[PDB]
């Protein structure tokens, strides 16, 4: 996930944005389309399906 321009400005010293950081995410494919689906941290795979 790219850093927010505003996150970067706020970040300073101990709170640092400079850490390379990323999330886990899903996008379900559909004939001719792609949609990003929010992923609950407590999501059974069955529940997602």
């Amino acid at each position: 996930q790219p850093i927010s321009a505003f996150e970067r400005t706020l970040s300073s010293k101990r709170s640092s944005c400079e850490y390379d950081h990323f999330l886990l995410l899903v996008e379900w494919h559909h004939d001719g389309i792609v949609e990003h689906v929010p992923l609950d941290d407590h999501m059974d795979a069955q529940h997602l399906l």
Partner: protein, 49 residues
């Protein structure tokens, strides 16, 4: 070669090693307060035992 193969006397003062620990923890506080880079998710830390 002495210093690499040297080995200390086998007694370790357990009161000493506590005081090492105190000075060590204390020294990580020193470091961390003036350690340049903390990631923001790490901003809360405990200097343990």
């Amino acid at each position: 070669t002495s210093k690499l193969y040297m080995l200390s006397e086998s007694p370790l003062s357990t009161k000493q090693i506590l005081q090492t620990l105190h000075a060590l923890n204390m020294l990580i506080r020193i470091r961390l307060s003036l350690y340049e880079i903390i990631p923001t998710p790490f901003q809360h830390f405990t200097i343990a035992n």
